[PDB]
Homo-oligomer: 199 residues x 5
């Protein structure tokens, strides 16, 4: 049934179409687990970090009966709709470090969690402070407003490399909504706050 | 129904044909919102900047009925005709940092606004004074002259990063039309004047 | 059967997007790293840049043919094949693959893929100047298939005379790990590269 | 109709087939910037417009009651396999890779390119200047299949650390040891100096 | 000439080694060194530019000699999967990726390549200089499938000078029972 399931997903799902249920927004969960902090610059206020970007959402049309079938499959993301998330204050392309496969569950829920390396512009002052710096990253949909996509956040140092020259103090995630000057609509995002200190 | 709207587009879009409309030029709007200034060099006169390149134009073929269907949708740009804009004094290709989706309205109006990192050759003198420097970026079509394509420009620190170590004194944008030595036709560009200084 | 015939059949039966499980059991991937070079280390940042042959074998019994009177093996580009989704967990760059992306398929269905790879890691570089030397640990495991669908197991001679470093020992350990977020276990091979400066 | 002209092109251009009587290719470089110079390694980094023209009569159409010119993606056209022999990086193409096609089958491709070369940089701080020679030619076509013909500080950047004294172009034929066919190249000479 | 490309597209099998009978494909390789660009005697690494002349025969491509040759995209043809074992970067190919095809089936591919190698740089400044050896061979075809058999274009603006030899070698590795043929290129050069 596993090739069957991939087949059913590809015949049934269009990657270029938002899986909106009954003209409700598509609820996406976003969550970052930091793995490393590689380059910090206090003169230019730029940081280099590696993290797992956990992204989950639902496409109920994908679902299948798993009484005698596998409960899950791994699928190339090029066969799915994936939300067009962006980090607003990113100053580089995000470098994907892991195979780009999503996990689909028989109920129609999807998990995509690449490990990503990326550079951001953010407040770095206090890095050499026992209070540490707090760097804020904002992530949301680039071209879908809140009527279509809604972004909700789900040991902060649990998988953090210990060989990093930095140490994490806390990670906190909060939901925001913003309307920009060019356009009438609002865009939901998550601000992740990364509190870290040099060692 | 968002799916039915998109198939229609995929069927009739013609990515390689200017939606020219009866030998009148396509009227393109171009507008930059500077987001960050990352590096500057007074001796080489080079600049590294991140900006939103907002681009709008009409494709009539793309229109549909929004009465019982949605007003607009996100489309991959690989599925559309896109203006062949180039920045004349660019010295790198643009690194596109965001998903390459454009917004298409049922009236055929297309919005495409990517965050872009690029490096330019321009006048950096003054960057360390209070008066600041004035760097000019020129954007036009590369292969469509005045009759085929027209570009028109349409708060300057509204989206600028507060963690940048530069700041914007003013942004101004004026239209222009130039004939080159090689060929008789004229080309339109938008001239953008970034007046900024080191904080 | 000729080489063309074998490739034709592989293209007819291969399904690059779908794991080739035998009934119930997990695909048993084998992995061993053969280190060729250690190019840049940083004692301050704890980052290494290494070159290695990633020898990877596994079985896809659907590909099999009778080779009594035909070739026993062919080379196939990996896009024609299902390949395991292995990741180095503590890598901080993509793998630069240096060799032609070709796999070797045996008539019984065994597959061998062994790319030469240059990659950068985040590991312990302390003591690289010491007699004890440094011990960098590289962790490799399936990224999206848990232990019931993929298992990985471990299977200095070709290390460059010209590197600025010498190898002391290379050991491997198997781990199985369930993570905070998700209910499954994921297997990996931990390789320990014990090296020091000449 | 402009759509109609492209449709015709797609089913009329064999991108893999040269259209021949050697194809006559015109090459000229208009320099936009000199970005780096390294007097010790003899390396230069430059930005230039590559004007490339050639005829593809197979592509022609009727100009009356018809648009005289269209913009076409080069991926859909044959294009000369030009290469710079003293290049030491791949060309970064800074512009959209579209050609323009006239109704009489004349073709224009003029990308903006950044590229690094190995050439003589001695004298760049001299009043006389330095003279950097770039040689361009077809890589796999000999004289009987392709000839290259060559057709100023005019578009050169005011903000460059350097200025152009003179640009000159010559034609050459060369036979290499490996193969007995002849290859034509246009040698472009750049006399420039630090201001 | 359009017809020849049509046939080649028609009969050419890019993924299938074109072995005749039971014998291996004879691949000729030779490097023409054009430029040595960087050198690091500390790390023993070099960055060079060379032309790689690679030639071999594929008879599924032949035509009744119409002109003798045509230029083809290598994407249209089987190409030998040579790799340089002591490479530490991917090849950066600087020329159009086009192969010349003779009517008899001879194929010639010669790109200009820029690559960094790991080799012996010790003494490059010395009168003796250093000597880098670049080993080149098929990565996944053993000696029964592929056999590999082996200075006037150097740039005068290079900061380096060349005092070049080529040798055949055949290697059986610990993992596997077959032998892999290679060519070792030996290059003695010093700082100018
Ligand atoms: C700045 N920003 C944050 N999240 C999304 C955006 C981009 C905007 C703001 C409004 N218009 C859009 C848009 C619409 C269509 C295509 N691309 C961007
Ligand atoms: C320099 N420039 C500014 N805007 C567009 C250009 C490019 C030029 C100048 C005129 N001829 C063209 C051309 C013609 C055909 C194909 N590509 C470019
Ligand atoms: C950290 N790690 C090691 N091996 C795999 C992972 C990633 C995780 C573990 C939890 N679930 C996954 C997953 C599942 C589906 C898609 N992507 C990631
Ligand atoms: C050095 N050069 C200048 N123009 C062409 C060349 C390359 C050579 C030398 C002769 N024949 C070739 C060739 C033939 C087929 C494919 N690639 C290169
Ligand atoms: C190390 N080396 C030198 N020349 C070729 C090689 C690669 C080898 C050695 C034996 N087995 C392989 C192989 C076989 C199939 C696919 N990939 C690699």
């Amino acid at each position: 049934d596993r090739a069957d399931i991939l087949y059913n997903i590809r015949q049934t799902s269009r990657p270029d179409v938002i899986p909106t249920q009954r003209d409700r927004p598509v609820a996406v969960s976003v969550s970052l687990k930091f793995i490393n902090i590689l380059e910090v610059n206090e003169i230019t206020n730029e940081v280099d970090v590696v993290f797992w970007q956990q992204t989950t959402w639902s496409d109920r049309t994908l679902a299948w009966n798993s009484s005698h079938s596998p409960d899950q499959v791994s699928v190339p993301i090029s066969s799915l709709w994936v939300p067009d998330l962006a980090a607003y204050n990113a100053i580089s392309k995000p470098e994907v470090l892991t195979p780009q496969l999503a996990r689909v569950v028989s109920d129609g829920e999807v998990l995509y969690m690449p490990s990503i390396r990326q550079r951001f512009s953010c407040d770095v002052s206090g890095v050499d402070t026992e209070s540490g710096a707090t760097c804020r990253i904002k992530i949301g949909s680039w071209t879908h407003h809140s009527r279509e996509i809604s972004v909700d956040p789900t040991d902060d140092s649990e998988y953090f490399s210990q060989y990093s020259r930095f140490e994490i103090l806390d990670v906190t995630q909060k939901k925001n909504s913003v309307t920009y000057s060019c356009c009438p609509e609002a865009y939901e995002d998550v601000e992740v706050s990364l509190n870290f200190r040099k060692k």
